Amino acid sequence: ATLFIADLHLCVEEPAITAGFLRFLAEEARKADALYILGDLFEAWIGDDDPNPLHRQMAAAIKAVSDSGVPCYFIHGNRDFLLGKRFARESGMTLLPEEKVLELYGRRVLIMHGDTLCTDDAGYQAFRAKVHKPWLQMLFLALPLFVRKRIAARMRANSKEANSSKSLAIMDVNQNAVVSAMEKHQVQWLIHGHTHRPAVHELIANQQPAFRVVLGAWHTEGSMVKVTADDVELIHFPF
Ligand SMILES: CCCCCCCCCCC[C@@H](O)CC(=O)N[C@H]1[C@@H](OP(=O)(O)O)O[C@H](CO)[C@@H](O)[C@@H]1OC(=O)C[C@H](O)CCCCCCCCCCC
Ligand SMILES: [Mn+2]
Ligand SMILES: [Mn+2]
């Protein structure tokens, strides 16, 4: 089986999630064919040079999975788009582009974080385009770590404030964008996160039955999608 997770938002002061993730790696990822992490692995990323001890332990635990023969892949989220090649090497992860099609046991599946489908949120998409500019990223990364942490803290705070004022519609995926992505790639299956609204949605793409499977955020329990020859299963599991 091939596993998909997203939206862990790992951080020091959410220790149940950290413990749950370590257990997941040892008990589930170890026996899988591959693991895909579809963004927001960390609560925030302000550069691979961050000395946070959590990053060291998480990198080693992920690298132990891929060193055991189970490849680990990462699509960036909105929290952790700065995660780079240095941390990918430390963690034994392969970095993927923002959209990727997999063929799994004969089944073509599109994967992404999900935030690029939220096309009605013009304010977010504006922000996203700016912070994805390599020149601006490279400029941010030149600041002292403590300044980067203050910026991130402010961004987190203003994000929470902005979100409480936004309609549910602009913060969920746009259906035209969903269908457009699934027809661009001619898939009947899409797995994403970002919205923190776990569900299996039925829809039409390519004039055929299609499915959009949304991972849950990790808080008091975890969420994965398990893909086998015969099934695509959204599974919630306790810590
Ligand atoms: C150049 C390199 C910069 C590097 C920075 C590295 C640190 C990144 C830290 C993570 C920030 C991230 O949380 C912001 C974000 O993505 N918010 C969108 C997201 O909501 P979340 O709160 O993240 O769940 O998902 C929501 C649903 O899709 C969406 O609505 C939120 O988007 C917003 O709230 C964006 C607002 O519309 C505008 C953003 C205002 C940010 C304030 C900037 C303060 C910076 C000051 C520095 C001078
Ligand atoms: Mn998230
Ligand atoms: Mn997200």
Numbering used by the authors: 2 to 240
From the study:
The LpxH enzyme cleaves the pyrophosphate bond of UDP-2, 3-bis(3-hydroxytetradecanoyl)-glucosamine (UDP-DAGn) to yield lipid X (PubChem CID 123907) and UMP in the fourth step of lipid A biosynthesis. Roughly 70% of Gram-negative bacteria, including the WHO critical priority Gram-negative pathogens for R&D of new antibiotics, utilize this enzyme. The importance of LPS, and lipid A in particular, for the viability and virulence of Gram-negative bacteria makes the inhibition of lipid A biosynthesis a promising target for the development of antibiotics. To enable a structure-based drug design approach for the optimization of JEDI-1444, we produced LpxH proteins from E. coli (EcLpxH) and K. pneumoniae (KpLpxH) and solved the X-ray crystal structures of various enzyme-product and inhibitor complexes during the optimization of the chemical series.
As for HiLpxH, the EcLpxH and KpLpxH proteins copurified with a bound molecule of lipid X in the substrate binding site but we were able to develop protocols to displace the product and form enzyme–inhibitor complexes. The 1.35-Å resolution EcLpxH complex, in particular, provides a detailed view of this portion of the substrate-binding site. In contrast to the highly mutated EcLpxH structure previously published, the lid of our structure is generally well-ordered. One of the lipid X aliphatic tails extends toward the protein surface and is partially solvent-exposed, while the other is completely buried in the enzyme interior. Indeed, the binding of the lipid X product to EcLpxH and PaLpxH structures shows differences at the ring 1-binding site that would be expected to affect inhibitor binding.
